[PDB]
Each structure stands twice: as structure tokens, then as C-alpha cells.
Design a protein around this nucleic acid. Sequence first.
RNA 1: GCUAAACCUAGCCCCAAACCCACUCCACCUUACUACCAGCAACCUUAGCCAAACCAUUUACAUAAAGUAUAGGCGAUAGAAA
RNA 2: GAACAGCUAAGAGCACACCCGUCUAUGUAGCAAAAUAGUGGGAAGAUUUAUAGGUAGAGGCGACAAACCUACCGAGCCUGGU
RNA 3: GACCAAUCUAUCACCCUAUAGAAGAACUAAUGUUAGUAUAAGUAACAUGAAAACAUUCUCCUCCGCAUAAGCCUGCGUCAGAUCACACUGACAAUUAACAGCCCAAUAUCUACAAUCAACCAACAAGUCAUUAUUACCCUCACUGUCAACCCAACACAGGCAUGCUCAUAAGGAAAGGUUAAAAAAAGUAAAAGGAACUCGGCAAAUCUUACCCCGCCUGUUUACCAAAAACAUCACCUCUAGCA
Lengths: 176, 97, 109, 189, 111, 46
Amino acid sequence: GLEEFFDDPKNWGQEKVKSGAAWTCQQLRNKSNEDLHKLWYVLLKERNMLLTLEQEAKRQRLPMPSPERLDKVVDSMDALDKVVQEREDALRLLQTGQERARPGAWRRDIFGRIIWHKFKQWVIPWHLNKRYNRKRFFALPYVDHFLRLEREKRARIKARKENLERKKAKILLKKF
Amino acid sequence: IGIRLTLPPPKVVDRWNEKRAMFGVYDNIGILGNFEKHPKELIRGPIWLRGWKGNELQRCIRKRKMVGSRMFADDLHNLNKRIRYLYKHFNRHGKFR
Amino acid sequence: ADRMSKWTSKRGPRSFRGRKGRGAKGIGFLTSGWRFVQIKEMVPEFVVPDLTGFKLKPYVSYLAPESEETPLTAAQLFSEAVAPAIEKDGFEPTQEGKLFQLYPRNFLR
Amino acid sequence: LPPHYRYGMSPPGSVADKRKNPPWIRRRPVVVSDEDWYLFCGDTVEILEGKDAGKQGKVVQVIRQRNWVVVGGLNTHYRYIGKTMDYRGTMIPSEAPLLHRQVKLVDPMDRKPTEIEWRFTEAGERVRVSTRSGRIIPKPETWIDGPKDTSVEDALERTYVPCLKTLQEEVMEAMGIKETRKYKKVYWY
Amino acid sequence: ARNVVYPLYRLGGPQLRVFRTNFFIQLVRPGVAQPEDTVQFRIPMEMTRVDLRNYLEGIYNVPVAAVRTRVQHGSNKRRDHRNVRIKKPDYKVAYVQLAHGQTFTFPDLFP
Amino acid sequence: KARGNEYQPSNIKRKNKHGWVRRLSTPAGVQVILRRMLKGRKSLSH
RNA sequence: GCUAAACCUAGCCCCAAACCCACUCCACCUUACUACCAGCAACCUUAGCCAAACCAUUUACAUAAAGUAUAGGCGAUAGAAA
RNA sequence: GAACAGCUAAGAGCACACCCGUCUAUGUAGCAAAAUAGUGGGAAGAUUUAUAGGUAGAGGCGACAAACCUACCGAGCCUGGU
RNA sequence: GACCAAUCUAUCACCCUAUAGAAGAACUAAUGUUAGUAUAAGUAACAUGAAAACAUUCUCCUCCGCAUAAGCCUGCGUCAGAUCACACUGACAAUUAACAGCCCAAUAUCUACAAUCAACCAACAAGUCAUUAUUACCCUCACUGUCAACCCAACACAGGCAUGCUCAUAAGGAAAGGUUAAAAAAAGUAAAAGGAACUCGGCAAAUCUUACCCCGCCUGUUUACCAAAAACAUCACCUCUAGCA
Ligand SMILES: [Mg+2]
Ligand SMILES: [Mg+2]
Ligand SMILES: [Mg+2]
Ligand SMILES: [Mg+2]
Ligand SMILES: [Mg+2]
Ligand SMILES: [Mg+2]
Ligand SMILES: [Mg+2]
Ligand SMILES: [Mg+2]
Ligand SMILES: [Mg+2]
Ligand SMILES: [Mg+2]
Ligand SMILES: [Mg+2]
Ligand SMILES: [Mg+2]
Ligand SMILES: [Mg+2]
Ligand SMILES: [Mg+2]
Ligand SMILES: [Mg+2]
Ligand SMILES: [Mg+2]
Ligand SMILES: [Mg+2]
Ligand SMILES: [Mg+2]
Ligand SMILES: [Mg+2]
Ligand SMILES: [Mg+2]
Ligand SMILES: [Mg+2]
Ligand SMILES: [Mg+2]
Ligand SMILES: [Mg+2]
Ligand SMILES: [Mg+2]
Ligand SMILES: [Mg+2]
Ligand SMILES: [Mg+2]
Ligand SMILES: [Mg+2]
Ligand SMILES: [Mg+2]
């Protein structure tokens, strides 16, 4: 029902709510999968309700009763997502020992910088796809000059930061 | 106005500093240290020069032929431009000739 | 003529306006006569269970105790599921024809 | 926030703080180091500079971002709060911060300003220990359930069962959904 | 979900499932007084019409009849002291219409 | 006649004459984009 | 006295020393920030300004030997090793 | 692909829209770093134009004006030699 | 040749001075550069139709206005404060597809009588629109644009802009901040006798017009931005080259 989009009408107009303590990681880890799914659904419903309340308050030109509950709900959702991701990673490592769920591999584009190419998933192989064939992967030699220039710029920035830290330490020592 | 107003704080200066109290020490080791190390090796500075006065153009050629093998691209280009300009201004422009 | 202006659907002409579009995620395709085909298999189905008699609540009480954080690892899961290893005194190595394959992300979330 | 943010008396999230430090300030950052902090909020301290150079009090706020410590009832400067209208109003003695060193900690019974060390004791592990003698200085310093609050035992039931079954497949088996169709192989390039 | 790669359904694949939804939704007050049983919704970008229909029918069980979504443009005529543009976050808007003539009215708060 | 109006805006021609595809087809645009990235500009190309 | 005037700290140059960076989540060579379907791509003597009052051959990319031999419209110049 | 009223009657004639501007006057730091009215030639044809692609300088194009190629083209600007 | 303002360095100084080491070491000018401010100057340029109960009414103009391809991205609605008065500063939300876009499985394979009321009349520039048999196919409403006083001209710019529509009306707007009308200039109304006699030129405004010479076939184009032609190009003639995919 649409009534779930708002809290108890008795609490409408109070500028104060008694609810906090976000779900930590250990508490989520110490729960089954169905209970975790139900908790995630309830937290999503609560987040929707709190977002609707925030929008209504912004439209009414009034402050928020307590966004701490929304922050804690977001933290609990993030913790649940992290726990689920860790469980999936452990299952994948114990099933095939493969790191990173999404497959991929390193490649060299035109710029030469070693970029972690991401797979797009296709239906036909790679030895006949017209579009993928155009996406070449090679930097050629002439880009070596630009690569050296970028490396020199990075080294200059690093040396500048080092001299900056050294001057800061010297000034601190001089002050005392 | 160019001149400021309030005076500056008292510029403290430690005349008996660790470097000042030891400035010039251990120098001249050759005339009495049975000649074991030249004073030119005591100064701590650039690697391409360490005991050779020279001149601007000469110092530039030295830095090029001694560090140019590991210098940056822009730095090497600027050094070459400076050397060429100094040569064109010395071996042609000037006075008394 | 603006470089900072992020290109979107409210800029180009009718062609690019209708081609790009926001994150639509193609669910079907067209069949010549501008007759879109809504593939029932590609349409998502929100598997929402019944929230009848739920014990926990979206908010915890401060009176509860505090425990240390210990990210679960593969070694702990293996030590836990160690029934056949001890009984020696079942595994799925190849899962290419499995329902929800592990390595190739085939299951949503 | 941008670098060199001059942390004022007000917190970094109030209207007064935002008005004091707009997003176009470039003041001179004051120099401050001292990672092993020891002045906590609510500790018996004693001032040794300016007004009340001896009277003891209690620390209220501790802004370690600039080595500032506010004591209660000491180093107070009067202020005409608000004033709303154009008249007298009301005066309130507002406190001020105090850098460390100048303000040392107070002993329990000795009641003197002395330095504290971080000795690794057997209690696990580092704790405040005075120099004049031992005296382990302690640290400074109800919730009925609500409608959306869990409980004290439900969150400690431990219902997880480690089994290689995946969350998606487990939910599918629990809900009773069936799908005899198989997932044909796909490419990944 | 949102910001997640989807499994490409070839031809003889299984039904696409969606466990643990990521994206969210939130309703707002009518702008120019919408007709009866017409609820507004602020939907993110990664979300279609049938997606929201199934979302509602599965979560809130609201008998959704017809839906008509659209994208809104965010303001961008404002500069700070740095003379840099600021584009507000864009979002999609929907106009859900209940069935059976339930007649829903936007409730008010702050009495 | 008025010579202060030569611009005829058109996203199609703009993106076709200065597009990522056109800037990566030949090594000229590749070097252009590399120099732009080295300079540190925000936008590399239309 | 209106308008004004100063603050100096963020950061910059030199070498002295090591050889650097680089995928949480989706997106990026088609119109870049676009989940999705039948076709060739690589290796090239750099020129030129300027000085000989023009200008063609000519003009530069630890110490000592040595600015020597040697080359050079044998003139302006260039210039090694054992 | 689009446009060309009507009138007299054929790369015909007058004349709407429309294409260009032979002349006066104002403007000359102005409406405009090339504007305002008619007298002006055409206005079913060597006619104008909406969209896209191709021809780039030792070059392209050119019903030759040695004219144009982004306000200054006897050969547009940038980069490095300068 | 004799001195010397400023700085850092090594020397006791210490209400500001001395001995030596260094010069990015010392400004009335280089139509020199940056920042503010005098000078013409409170001069040139400038807007807002009238009454009023601010409900409303009155006077005039209109080749302008409606929707859309090209183009912009919230850019005169509300809320509080800023001020020719405000389109200025922060929140509010719009703009919901049926209109347009996002579009076609393969194999052999074939469309001689243009359109112009197309039937009389026909013509040259010879012309824009079609399918056959087999295989496999049965799930169907997903995404984008939708506002405005709006685009390109550094400006709120007499400037430039295509398609279907009545082109003057059912659209679209206000040339007059208020007083007097010194001098000079410009756009209009009339003129006692002449109608080109001032003027190198019939060069603005009106009549509406007769007979000649040079050159150019006539149309068309040229130096966008001072010369628009007596120049440029050819329907006609003529010279040379080429026996082929
Ligand atoms: Mg202009
Ligand atoms: Mg010379
Ligand atoms: Mg010469
Ligand atoms: Mg040798
Ligand atoms: Mg003329
Ligand atoms: Mg003049
Ligand atoms: Mg003519
Ligand atoms: Mg005519
Ligand atoms: Mg006509
Ligand atoms: Mg040039
Ligand atoms: Mg001066
Ligand atoms: Mg001058
Ligand atoms: Mg001067
Ligand atoms: Mg004057
Ligand atoms: Mg007016
Ligand atoms: Mg519109
Ligand atoms: Mg006036
Ligand atoms: Mg008369
Ligand atoms: Mg008369
Ligand atoms: Mg006379
Ligand atoms: Mg006469
Ligand atoms: Mg005459
Ligand atoms: Mg006549
Ligand atoms: Mg002619
Ligand atoms: Mg001219
Ligand atoms: Mg002319
Ligand atoms: Mg001709
Ligand atoms: Mg001809």
C-alpha cells in the first residue's frame, strides 16, 4: 500500500525520532541469507520513506527532524552489500580461485598507458565482429616521446612535493 | 607608495651556529695532511662541476656533455637553445675586435 | 559550441537524440515496421518475499553489545565446511554448465 | 573542504563557521606535530598563563586540529549575544581556547600540574601515569526500545549456516521458483 | 539494480532474476495539481517503465494501471567565485495511475 | 554584407569534423589528443 | 578624510638521492563517457634561420693531449685518436 | 528534397515572395569591426536554398576577379628551428 | 680617478653604523607592460503612449504571427532579500506519446512505356517511388525530444535565417522621461515667372517620357568589404592530340 511511504502519522510534526544504531558488519555476517535479504528489503523501504520525507521537508521549507537515521540506514545497506560481496568473493575463490568477479585482462591502448581493459560480453566471437575489430590495441613508437614527457612531469611533481615537505619540516624545526 | 610602514621583527642570527662555528674547518688538508685529498673534492654541489671555474658557455657545454645523457627533453632543448644563443652572442656579437 | 557542456540527449538532432538516450538498457529490439518486441525473458522480475512475522528491524538498539570486525575469508569457510574432509579419515570443480556460474558474472547481484 | 582550513571555534558544519570561512578565503595558516595527544574532554586541568593562572577547571572542547583546549569557567570573555533588536540585550561570558603545554593536567590527590607519560602497563596497555608517583589517571566521560528497534537477543541468534549454495540459488530454492531452462554459453572477448 | 552489468539473454536462456535491488525511488507532491489517483515518482536514470511497474507490484503490491515516465533537465545557470558551472543532478519523473479508482490523495505533514 | 556572422552551428558537422572517431582514425588526431592530455586541459575533444 | 598604502604564506628554481605511476560499482575507437551480432592499418637521408657583410659546397647537438694533426668556394670555419 | 502569387502571352515581358545591390541621403568610436527607402536586373530557369559528404597551401578551387580558402590571402594561424 | 643609497655572507654592534666578498647593485623619457586615478565630461548616447477604481478604458502601427528541421539549455512563474523599476541572488517544479527519432533474416531474382487535372496536344533536359519461390519465425508495447521573451553576430545588437499556413485579420507591438523650440544638419508638405539657364555630369523629388554615337550576340558572373564594366563565359566557326575497357 501507499501508506508505507510514510511513517506513523502520530509522529508527523515532532522534529525528533528515537531510532539509531546502524547494522555493523559482524551482526550482518552472523545472519542467514533469507534474513539478510529481508533486512535489506526493509532497509530499502525505510530509505525510500526517509527520502520522501526529505523531499517533502525541502518542498515545505523546513529543517529535517533527524537525518541520523537515514545516514545509519545507508551505512547498514552499505555494510550488507559489502558482506554479500565478501561472501561471493569467498565462494568464487573456493570454487575456481579467480580474483575479481567481472572478467578482464591488461591491454595497451593508443596512449600506451597500461589500462585494465573491461570485457563487454558479446554473442559472436572476436575474429569476425566488425566493431570490436576497429578497437585496435597498440601505442606505436612515436608515443614514447609523450610517455617520457608524462613520466618527467610526474617526477617533477614528486620532487616538488618532496621539497615542499622538506621545507615544511625545516620551518617546523626552526619554530622550535 | 613603495616604502612600507611598520618595521620588521628582530631578525635573530646565531653567529655561533653549528655550520658557522665549523665553517672552513678541515680545509687545506693537503699542505699538511701529507697530500691525501684535494680540497676541490670537499665542496658538495653539482656532479658535472666540482673544482673548475670556467664560464657560462663552458659550464653549459660541460653540463650538456656530462649530464645531457640523462636530462629531460624540455630541459635538454632549453639548454641547447641557451648554448646556441650564447655562442651566437659571443663568437659574433660584442666589442673589441 | 561548448566543451564543458556534457553531451546528452538534450543537444543533438533528432537522430542522435533518439539514438543515444539515457541509460535505457536495451530490453528488446525492433521488427522492421516500428513494432517493438518486449522479450519476457529480458524483463526483470523483482523477487520480493513476504514480510510476515519478521523478527529484526531496520534499526538496532544501543543496549546491544559490541563485537570485533573479522572479514570472512576463504580459509574460514573451508574450515567450517569440513565435513567430508574429516569423514575421509562433494565439490563442484567445473561449473560451465551450471545455472548461475561463478567466475563469469551471469547472475544479477 | 579546501586545504589550509582555519578551524575556528564553531564546528565545521554550522552557519557561523561557513560565514566566517567562505569558499574563497586564503588566510595565513597558523603553524602547529604532537601525535601522542593526552588532553581529553573532561579532564582536571590547570591554567598557567593569562587570567586565572592557577585555578583548576574542566575541559569542555578539544579541537586538536590546531592544538586548542577550552576549559569551563576560565579565560572567559564577555559578549553581547545576538541582541535581536537595537538595545542593550544580555551579556554572557564566552570561553576561549588554550594551547597545550601552558595548560597541564591535575593530579588526583596531589592536585598539582605535572607531566604524564605513556607507560606500557600489563592492563593492555598504554595508560596515563603521573611522574610524581603512580596514580593511573582514568578517562573522562537509559535507551528504551522503539517501534523500529530490533532487540538485545534477536541480533545475537547466529542463524548463518556456512554451505556452498550461493545466495541467489538459496533464495530461489526457498521461494520455490523453478526454471528448467539452461544458460547457454556466452562470449567475453 | 543500477550500475551493474546485466547477463545478456541469448535465446534459450532462463528468466532474468533481480535479487537485492540497488536503485531506489521516492514520490513528491504534485506540481500543478495532478488528476485523481495520480501519484508522482522521482525515478533515477537507470530505470524503465515496466521496471517500475514490476518494482511496485512486487514491493508495495499497488495495483498500477498505466505509467508515463520522462526525463527532467537540471539547472545550470549559476557560477561560484571560480567562474565554474554547476549542473544539478538530473533525475527521471513518472506519473503512476492507480487502478480500480482507489482515489489517492497526497498526505500533508507539519500540522 | 555583414561579415560578422559566419558560424552555422550543427552538432552533426561539428562532431564529424572534430570527433573522437575522426581524431583516432589517423595518427594526426592521436598526436593531437596526446599533446592535449600532456598540456592538462579538461576537455580533450568535442 | 573620501579614495588609498604595507603586511606573508601557499608555493616556486638548483642540483645533492632513489629509477616512477597504473582496475572498488558500472562507461567509454559508433556521435567518446552509447549492455548486445558476418572483414586494408607499422618501419622513411629532417629541413631551415643565421656567418662568410649576397650566397649554391659549407655553419655547433672528470683533466691533459689540443684548439695539434687533419678537412675546408684551402676563406668564413670545422676539428679525433693513439 | 523544398520554393517560385498574379497579369500579358519562348534559356518571352511586367510584377508577390525571393536573389544581388548601379545612385542619393543619414551613419563614420554608428543600428552595423559593412546598416537604413526607391529609383534598380531577374523572378519555370546558366534560378535560390534546408541536410550530409568530398576537393587544403610546392595546395584546393576558380563562367580569370592572379579573386576566395573564417573579419587583414601576391598566398590564413599554431607549434619547434628564431 | 676619489666616494657612495639597498640587500645576503664572516666579524663586538643592537634607536642603524664599519671592514672585505655579489650584482636581477641605484630612472624626468625607450607612440615600454601591470593597478588605480585626472582630461575633454557630467559634454556625445540613451530609453517609458495616455487616464485611472491600477478592475478597466482610450490613441496609433503592423510583410507580421502560428508550429517545425537547424540551434540554446531553464534563461521576465511562486517564495525572502537586493533597486527608470527589475530578467539579480538561494529553494520550489515543470516537459508525461498517439507527433518525430531509435528499424528490416538468408538464398537464385527483375521493374521498356516518366510527372506536369495526363484523355485529347505533345515535347526534350530521357526522367524520384513495384516483386517472384523455399527455409525458420508467433514473444508485442522498451528508450529519447516535448519549457521560455529562445539561434549566430564581443552588447538587451534597425544585422543574417528554411518549411505549410488569411497575408490583415480572430495574430503581433508602443515611434512621445518632463518643459522651450536659440543656431546648424537631415526626412517630409507648398510655392507668386522660367523649367536644368548654378552644375564636368537630368546627380535626390516629380513627370513617365522623343530621336542619336561607341562597345558588347542576347541571358548569366565577376573584384563578399570603395572600381559590377566597353571585362569574364558560349549557341557558331576553327587548330592540335587519342584506336581503347
Ligand atoms: Mg562584431
Ligand atoms: Mg647572424
Ligand atoms: Mg649568409
Ligand atoms: Mg682516449
Ligand atoms: Mg556605377
Ligand atoms: Mg565621414
Ligand atoms: Mg545583365
Ligand atoms: Mg522581369
Ligand atoms: Mg513570376
Ligand atoms: Mg602562411
Ligand atoms: Mg618610476
Ligand atoms: Mg607617440
Ligand atoms: Mg615610460
Ligand atoms: Mg570638449
Ligand atoms: Mg517610447
Ligand atoms: Mg516547443
Ligand atoms: Mg527627452
Ligand atoms: Mg506660374
Ligand atoms: Mg516659381
Ligand atoms: Mg556659373
Ligand atoms: Mg550651364
Ligand atoms: Mg547639361
Ligand atoms: Mg522616347
Ligand atoms: Mg553581353
Ligand atoms: Mg572595392
Ligand atoms: Mg559596386
Ligand atoms: Mg566564352
Ligand atoms: Mg555557346
